[PDB]
């Protein structure tokens, strides 16, 4: 019934010292039935990262849509799109379907190639933007994530520390959600490099 | 002159004429003669059907629009089909919606207005056919003459087509006479056939060559062709 | 949500709380409920966030184009007419409840618009779930001829009524002052009476605490 | 009526030719020359900027080389504005394809679609054709490096080396005289500059009057890379090839 | 080739003959008009000529009330003048509905000018052979005169004149302002501005006027109205008692 | 909502309360339900605030364009435009409107347009939730050709009673007098009418 | 009725010329001179306010228009065509950009949009090309300052400095002499004023000249405060006075 | 619903589809082939709403054949599955959505590897070693999760399927009248006409 | 050059629209018709040329009523006149539907004016080949109007158009001078009958039939009605008498 609880899954993003981190679980289920343990919910266009929780078909569609738009953006602007700009694009693209929305919970993370300033943002299914300074949670275990983040989080963590923090937030939240888990992947992002690590977790 | 102002109906000549319309009227003169006349109880249509070969038929010139109305054509057959069909609908509309037979004078107004539209807009062409409409309505018998220019006139009798002038002069003479042939169709029809022969020249009206139609007081518009018109030749 | 608008001797002021919720969960502890339509016409919005924002910027966009076209400063009655006719057209499906204020060539104005398109005029207004807490304060302290400072205090107090007494409202107080002869001044976080006390412990994890299966570098350069 | 002022841009001549297409081509023949040469390890696109001034900003300019995709680029000869209209719809077709199949659009498929659009203005609509000719340089995993050409008629063809615009005859003869199947990108770059240098209607061939681009598959990578040479880069290669 | 003079396309010299000939049409009525600005009012004078004795003089006018505040005088054939008037009225009414405030005179001028500019570019639309002079006392700009032509051009004036003898009236007005050094008639009452207007009309045209030779329109704060034969006669009398 | 329009000797007067509610909550207590569609043609609104405002705005628009072309419209013409909108869109509107205007040839006129979209010309009319309570009272106290003073009193009393019994009505009693003399605005506070 | 002109009014002549575009360019050549100069920290666009009568109020007619708070335009040719082009440009800046990305478009892209509008008037059915050439000057975060020229054909090109209209040939020559890549805004404004003096016949002062610049952000022209990131428009039209002051140091 | 299974072994993809076609009280047919060949090396099985089922499959088939002829080339299994997902993703937000779930099995001649794609009517696609639609997975996944090995020969795969089908015939309430099995490999698509007792 | 008279919305070098002028010719070439405004109404009359004895007398009515209070008569292409009346009828119906009150004559005039003016805006249409005299009684007075093919129209004291318009205009001017107080409905009817008889000299060759109608506040109650029987014969004689 609820399009946002059919497939399950979660995403979380955090800001650190000259870095940002975005993580997600890997489950794609069909209600109680687990279907895939390799459904990644994080994508990137240039140096901008986008996580999308919700109805899987929409997650896929929105990714294909943004690849399309950022591609033409680069061709015209002759430069890769920035987090702040992309966030606006995500918002207007979602509101454009105001009365027949995609059932997703988008999350944007990245660092502005010109100011180096870390950036993260969350949106509701119809485009409303939430630009947090600390963290953004999304998915079927968002209550759990809020709980984890509100406690585990502290400002200006170093890349190696933020990784521990965000992973523990994702991991323990997903273990309290029947529709999340089956793998997880964390992205640590810095001005010059991005490292992607797969975590080890329960498979039930 | 003319050649510069006769390319379409949307152009006025320096003198204030519409050549395309005039050219349309010319298609009528080239058409076979047809006559129409009425008393106070009946209205008759006598039309000379033209034949292509001697192996060809004599193309119909009379069309029924309703039980109380009909017309004769002179000019482009297709156009008459279009206009008579439009009149058939207008008659039908009046009956179905108002349970009222369409007045002949009103049928004329409709025809005028339809034809008028094809004389003021680019892309179209005027109708190339003349029509004689007869009918018996709530105000008696009626005869109308329709011209592609959109001009429709009510008369006691008239004719259109080639040499139509012969019959028209005859009728303008016989007026006081036939205008009183009330209660006797055979007489009105004979008078009509006499007016039409005033425009003959090529041959003489034969059996499969003559076509007559009548409507009146207690006579639903009916068309007579062939053997049925024999007793008039 | 708690939003108020208060008229004062030479202008108008609008304030709002900063809490954002999804059911009983606080999604954003500091979201902006104040919107700029033109430089000197601002909006306080309640209802559906995507909507207050979207409607605020659509009309704002057209107001800007109208301004350039007419070579005149935007008027509040214009932003108001464009907003209500838009909201009315959508029969309430665009959940925007706004308190629109501002100054223009004709003076200072204060209006309220509901999702269905009806508008109201008054010297003090409140909307949102804190609506009643705020209105109690306004009904108790408003008076004709308030000074810019008296108004900011009153508006600020009314938002506080909602922050403390309404579960739908919380966190900080944003204010925007529009005075007839000057620039409009937006005071984001004019008040921050809800700072989280220091935690009882640090939850920083020793590095290596998380089990990792695979690792790789992501290619960001084309 | 209107019929009076209708040029009837889409009719046949008694000889069975398309007036407008023929006249559009005539127009194109006066455009700065553009050349496309395909080597074994890459493709070269070179073009001569028609008309320039001391004050013309060459760093922020691009009137002949456009990127359509990450694997496809084109050289323009004719009306810049017209070309842009086409280029944009071409860029969109590429993305649609990508979104539908999750694969980059094969070079010909994109060239054919763009050509069909041109062909359209030729058979219906009563509009004038686009005064533009394109040279397409691109790569895909089915035919590798490809070089195509399309003109106002909507017709397109494949080449090893080709030129469009002014003095194409002279250019074509010079290319058909020194082109060899086993060429190498660097060899092609040289042939291109040489050819343009001999067919220019201008005094000399300076960098400020050129645009250069290459689509190579950098051995140290394994992928296809497009390079739209910068003013300085052109200035450099212009010296090395001995044209200083 | 030679059709570049029938529709609005460029001539080899870069001209639009149809627009030029449209300007020619504006003088077809052989009527002159002028507008001047008061201290807080705007006045427009226009010759009224009723040749046919069978005409109802009260229905012969080239001055229109576009809205409560905007007045428009037209130099050109009446059928085109009325077309323009209707459009202007519709535009002014719609604007009020959409934006909540009365359409400014200068804005309505721009809008009409833009509409005209279009007939200039699209081939199926012919330009209107009229010149529109809009007047009012704008709530932001005060007394205002904005005029538009078949070319889609428009601008504001301190005062202006239109018609066959436009040039004479213009240099007359020019001279007066070079003298006064101000850009308006420093009078408090519109009546005197109307008298000033009529006077200079007489000097420039070198003709005397009766109460039926003129047409007068006046715009003030929140209202634009036209004078009657008797309201004019009163004006004509006053100017007489000074000469 | 409690509204009424009464025609008297010198023209007509419109009256209304100023309360708007959303449930038992009084959202606005100084609402102006007397809307101007023309200089001397006003209306009393009842029903949906959004609906009646939108309707009024459109009518005002129509009468302003009508005036630009045909001069001042009759009160009947105004009621006609209101009716056209209300009847033609009866499925999507909830508007009860009383049209009142002053003509020189016709003096004061009152037309009532209830939910269905039908029009009714009357010596006076009452509508709105609170109107139900004053039907008896108004029918026993209305008199044709009253003076401005008597009328203002008939309205002040009627509406104070409407307000007394109807929780949906309240605030101040607003009035608008339409006569040859011009347009006059009146307001009466609680402390005055509550003790009548 | 109904526009029945659905065919092109601009076609290819046997020589390959597009007559209507050529003629439109001719109309531009008769137009009053206008120019643009790019400095290192700003751009300047100027033109002459050829008052078509002393009774006309030259202020109620800006030849220099703001398109976005960081982009301005000026022209040479048919004024009315320019005016509607300006309205369309301001709108397209929103509809095709601001409403999608939440930020104003970069000079090149808006120029691109404007160019597209003109290219269409060169091929769509039933219309004639625009009779103007525009000089658009702007600034955006990733491209800094830029200056573009857009012709009736829809073609546009970036410039360091250039002039269009009546005395464009001479003015462009005088510009080549004084331009270098180290000019400060004031220097360009100065050169602009000198270059324009040659093209002006009569009065040359701040009331007969129209000049605007694209320089630093003018927080004083924002209208509000409280948003650190919003610092004001870079576009600023000079006042009659500001011009005269610089005319003395001419 | 019907049975729709798919397993991707070492060098081929295998699709097993029930043969029954029921309409309420009666089983109208017991030899129904719920499959359509989209191209020489790509097969698609399907299950769902009565008419939509075959209408969609044939519609897709036609489109791929048209592409094949236009380009004289066979789209990669990946390409075909993306095309199909998009069609279903459009359909879900249309007036009357196609209620069809599919399994696309194809051998990529370029990569020289078999591929199995599972796409439901919402346009939800995922690539898998083995997959199913409907209730089929509930009875068989525990078995596949156990015995599946990436290096299985086509023969081992057929045996694992047989085991799956037996579990299905035992615990499932409906009589799906057996299954038709098909193999897709480097050499094309062939049907295992002998599974009624393999 | 020339040809400025072949398309409808074209301005000739002297600012004229020849096609409209040519339309006026068709009008002059038509029957003469007139209108006389009296002290509380208006009278319309027209000449009906009897082409022959075959035309049923009193039948082919020319004057037309719009709504219930407006009369219309025209000279020129008859079908064009009907078309215009049809539009006026729709025009009037719409006005009454929205405003309830029947359309004021002035308002009605501009409706016909705007419509006719509209047919001089495009070359896709032809101007109306008729001049129309129409009017009636409304909320404040009687009004008489005449509308030209150009769309031009004014309020008249008396009006005439057609073959013998000059005779008419002369006769009308006399009445205007000799009755500054205002003719009466009864009187205008006779006067009209006369003026048509006089103006019929410019067509004295053919015999005719007279047609009159009026709209008087006191005589017809503000409703347009045709002059029939006695009142008609009485006026036919009043003319026959003063024609000798």
Swiss-Prot record, chain A:
This is Proteasome subunit beta type-3. The 26S proteasome consists of a 20S proteasome core and two 19S regulatory subunits. The 20S proteasome core is composed of 28 subunits that are arranged in four stacked rings, resulting in a barrel-shaped structure. The two end rings are each formed by seven alpha subunits, and the two central rings are each formed by seven beta subunits. The catalytic chamber with the active sites is on the inside of the barrel. The modification Phosphoserine is found at residue 30. It comes from the Eukaryota. PROSITE patterns: PROTEASOME_BETA_1, PROTEASOME_BETA_2. The keyword Oxidoreductase does not apply. InterPro entries: Ntn_hydrolases_N (IPR029055), Proteasome_beta_3 (IPR033811), Proteasome_bsu_CS (IPR016050), Proteasome_sua/b (IPR001353), Proteasome_suB-type (IPR023333). PANTHER family: METALLOPROTEASE TLDD, PROTEASOME SUBUNIT BETA TYPE-3. Belongs to the peptidase T1B family. GO terms for biological process: proteasomal ubiquitin-independent protein catabolic process; proteasome-mediated ubiquitin-dependent protein catabolic process. There is a cross-link at residue 69 (Glycyl lysine isopeptide (Lys-Gly) (interchain with G-Cter in ubiquitin)). GO terms for cellular component: cytosol; nucleus; proteasome complex; proteasome core complex, beta-subunit complex. It comes from Saccharomyces cerevisiae (strain ATCC 204508 / S288c). GO terms for molecular function: endopeptidase activator activity. It is found in: Cytoplasm; Nucleus. Gene3D superfamilies: Glutamine Phosphoribosylpyrophosphate, subunit 1, domain 1 (3.60.20.10). Keywords: Cytoplasm, Isopeptide bond, Nucleus, Phosphoprotein, Proteasome, Ubl conjugation.
UniProtKB/Swiss-Prot annotation, chain C:
It is found in: Cytoplasm; Nucleus. Its main location: cytoplasm. The keyword NADP does not apply. The keyword Hydrolase applies. Pfam families: Pr_beta_C, Proteasome. The active site is at residue 1. It is an enzyme of class 3 (hydrolase). It catalyses: Cleavage of peptide bonds with very broad specificity. GO terms for molecular function: endopeptidase activity; threonine-type endopeptidase activity. It comes from the Eukaryota. PROSITE patterns: PROTEASOME_BETA_1, PROTEASOME_BETA_2. Keywords: Cytoplasm, Hydrolase, Nucleus, Protease, Proteasome, Threonine protease, Zymogen. One of its GO terms (cellular component) is proteasome storage granule. GO terms for biological process: proteasomal ubiquitin-independent protein catabolic process; proteasome-mediated ubiquitin-dependent protein catabolic process. Its EC number is 3.4.25.1. Signal peptide: none annotated. The proteasome degrades poly-ubiquitinated proteins in the cytoplasm and in the nucleus. It is essential for the regulated turnover of proteins and for the removal of misfolded proteins. The proteasome is a multicatalytic proteinase complex that is characterized by its ability to cleave peptides with Arg, Phe, Tyr, Leu, and Glu adjacent to the leaving group at neutral or slightly basic pH. It has an ATP-dependent proteolytic activity. The side chain of Thr-1 acts as a nucleophile, and the N-terminal amino group acts as a proton acceptor. Present with 11400 molecules/cell in log phase SD medium. Belongs to the peptidase T1B family. This is Proteasome subunit beta type-2. It comes from Saccharomyces cerevisiae (strain ATCC 204508 / S288c) (Baker's yeast).
From Swiss-Prot, chain D:
It comes from the Eukaryota. Keywords: Cytoplasm, Isopeptide bond, Nucleus, Proteasome, Ubl conjugation. The 26S proteasome consists of a 20S proteasome core and two 19S regulatory subunits. The 20S proteasome core is composed of 28 subunits that are arranged in four stacked rings, resulting in a barrel-shaped structure. The two end rings are each formed by seven alpha subunits, and the two central rings are each formed by seven beta subunits. The catalytic chamber with the active sites is on the inside of the barrel. There is a cross-link at residues 99, 198, 230 (Glycyl lysine isopeptide (Lys-Gly) (interchain with G-Cter in ubiquitin)). Present with 17100 molecules/cell in log phase SD medium. This is Proteasome subunit alpha type-3. The proteasome degrades poly-ubiquitinated proteins in the cytoplasm and in the nucleus. It is essential for the regulated turnover of proteins and for the removal of misfolded proteins. The proteasome is a multicatalytic proteinase complex that is characterized by its ability to cleave peptides with Arg, Phe, Tyr, Leu, and Glu adjacent to the leaving group at neutral or slightly basic pH. It has an ATP-dependent proteolytic activity. Pfam families: Proteasome (PF00227), Proteasome_A_N (PF10584). SMART domains: Proteasome_A_N. The keyword NAD does not apply. GO terms for cellular component: cytosol; nucleus; proteasome complex; proteasome core complex, alpha-subunit complex; proteasome storage granule. It is found in: Cytoplasm; Nucleus. NCBIfam families: PRK03996.1. The keyword Nucleus applies.
Swiss-Prot record, chain F:
Pfam families: Proteasome. The keyword Amino-acid biosynthesis does not apply. Its main location: cytoplasm. The active site is at 1 (nucleophile). Keywords: Acetylation, Cytoplasm, Hydrolase, Nucleus, Protease, Proteasome, Threonine protease, Zymogen. Its EC number is 3.4.25.1. It catalyses: Cleavage of peptide bonds with very broad specificity. GO terms for biological process: proteasomal ubiquitin-independent protein catabolic process; proteasome-mediated ubiquitin-dependent protein catabolic process. It is found in: Cytoplasm; Nucleus. It is an enzyme of class 3 (hydrolase). GO terms for molecular function: endopeptidase activity; threonine-type endopeptidase activity. It comes from the Eukaryota. InterPro entries: Ntn_hydrolases_N, Pept_T1A_subB, Proteasome_bsu_CS, Proteasome_sua/b, Proteasome_suB-type. GO terms for cellular component: cytosol; nucleus; proteasome complex; proteasome core complex, beta-subunit complex; proteasome storage granule. Belongs to the peptidase T1B family. The 26S proteasome consists of a 20S proteasome core and two 19S regulatory subunits. The 20S proteasome core is composed of 28 subunits that are arranged in four stacked rings, resulting in a barrel-shaped structure. The two end rings are each formed by seven alpha subunits, and the two central rings are each formed by seven beta subunits. The catalytic chamber with the active sites is on the inside of the barrel. The side chain of Thr-1 acts as a nucleophile, and the N-terminal amino group acts as a proton acceptor. Present with 7250 molecules/cell in log phase SD medium.
